[PDB]
Design a protein around this motif. Sequence first.
Motif, mmCIF file in Angstrom:
data_model
loop_
_atom_site.group_PDB
_atom_site.id
_atom_site.type_symbol
_atom_site.label_atom_id
_atom_site.label_comp_id
_atom_site.label_asym_id
_atom_site.label_seq_id
_atom_site.Cartn_x
_atom_site.Cartn_y
_atom_site.Cartn_z
ATOM 1 N N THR A 2 39.280 31.973 40.431
ATOM 2 C CA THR A 2 39.841 32.279 41.778
ATOM 3 C C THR A 2 38.748 32.107 42.835
ATOM 4 O O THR A 2 37.612 31.808 42.524
ATOM 5 C CB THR A 2 40.355 33.722 41.801
ATOM 6 O OG1 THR A 2 40.573 34.166 40.470
ATOM 7 C CG2 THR A 2 41.666 33.783 42.585
ATOM 8 N N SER A 3 39.080 32.292 44.085
ATOM 9 C CA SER A 3 38.057 32.136 45.158
ATOM 10 C C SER A 3 37.438 33.498 45.478
ATOM 11 O O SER A 3 36.234 33.661 45.470
ATOM 12 C CB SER A 3 38.720 31.571 46.416
ATOM 13 O OG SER A 3 39.247 32.642 47.189
ATOM 14 N N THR A 4 38.251 34.477 45.761
ATOM 15 C CA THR A 4 37.709 35.827 46.081
ATOM 16 C C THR A 4 38.412 36.874 45.217
ATOM 17 O O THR A 4 38.594 38.007 45.618
ATOM 18 C CB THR A 4 37.952 36.136 47.561
ATOM 19 O OG1 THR A 4 38.021 34.918 48.291
ATOM 20 C CG2 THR A 4 36.805 36.993 48.102
ATOM 21 N N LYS A 5 38.808 36.506 44.029
ATOM 22 C CA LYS A 5 39.499 37.478 43.138
ATOM 23 C C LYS A 5 40.919 37.725 43.652
ATOM 24 O O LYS A 5 41.202 37.577 44.824
ATOM 25 C CB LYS A 5 38.723 38.798 43.126
ATOM 26 C CG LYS A 5 38.419 39.198 41.681
ATOM 27 C CD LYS A 5 37.115 39.997 41.635
ATOM 28 C CE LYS A 5 35.930 39.032 41.548
ATOM 29 N NZ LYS A 5 35.550 38.842 40.120
ATOM 30 N N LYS A 6 41.817 38.098 42.781
ATOM 31 C CA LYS A 6 43.219 38.351 43.218
ATOM 32 C C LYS A 6 43.557 39.830 43.025
ATOM 33 O O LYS A 6 44.654 40.268 43.311
ATOM 34 C CB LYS A 6 44.174 37.499 42.382
ATOM 35 C CG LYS A 6 44.486 36.199 43.127
ATOM 36 C CD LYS A 6 45.378 35.314 42.256
ATOM 37 C CE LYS A 6 46.846 35.586 42.590
ATOM 38 N NZ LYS A 6 47.465 34.352 43.150
ATOM 39 N N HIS A 8 42.407 43.941 43.769
ATOM 40 C CA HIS A 8 41.512 44.796 44.597
ATOM 41 C C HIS A 8 41.522 46.222 44.045
ATOM 42 O O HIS A 8 42.050 46.483 42.982
ATOM 43 C CB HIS A 8 42.014 44.806 46.043
ATOM 44 C CG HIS A 8 41.206 43.837 46.861
ATOM 45 N ND1 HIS A 8 41.747 42.662 47.362
ATOM 46 C CD2 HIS A 8 39.896 43.852 47.274
ATOM 47 C CE1 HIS A 8 40.775 42.026 48.041
ATOM 48 N NE2 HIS A 8 39.626 42.708 48.018
#
Length: 149
Positions: A2-6, A8
Motif C-alpha cells: 500500500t502507499s500509506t497503509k489502509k 488506522h
Amino acid sequence: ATSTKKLHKEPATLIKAIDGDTVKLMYKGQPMTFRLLLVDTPETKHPKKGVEKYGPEASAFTKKMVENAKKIEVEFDKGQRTDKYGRGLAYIYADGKMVNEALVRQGLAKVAYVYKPNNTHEQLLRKSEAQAKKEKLNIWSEDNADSGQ
C-alpha cells in the motif's frame, strides 16, 4: 505494501479490565468490552487449591499494561466487530505495543483458533508464539534436561 497503509488506530481510554482476554475500555464515548482477537488465556478457577502454574499472571499484565500504557489505541479487524456476547473483537495496542503480541510473546497466552476472515495479524502471532516456545517462558519452561535420555 500500500502507499500509506489502509488500517488506522482510534484513541481509547481504560475503564476496567477483568481477565487477560476480557478488558473493558471507553471507546466511541461508551463503555464497550474488548476481547483480544486471535488470543486465548488459561482459566484460573479450574483449580481450587490456588493456581501454582500461571493463574494470576496474564490478568496482572493486562491491568498493569493497560493502567500504565497512557497511549492505548484499538484497531478493529475487517472481520466482524462484536462477537455474539457483545465482545469487541479487535486488537489492543498499549504504548504502541500489540497487547496481544505481548501476552503471546511473553508465554502467557496462545493464539486462539483462527477463523476467516479474521486473519490479519495471524502469521505475526505465530512468530511470537514460536519465540516464547524457543525461550521456554513460563509454560514453555517444561524441558528438564532432554540431554540424551
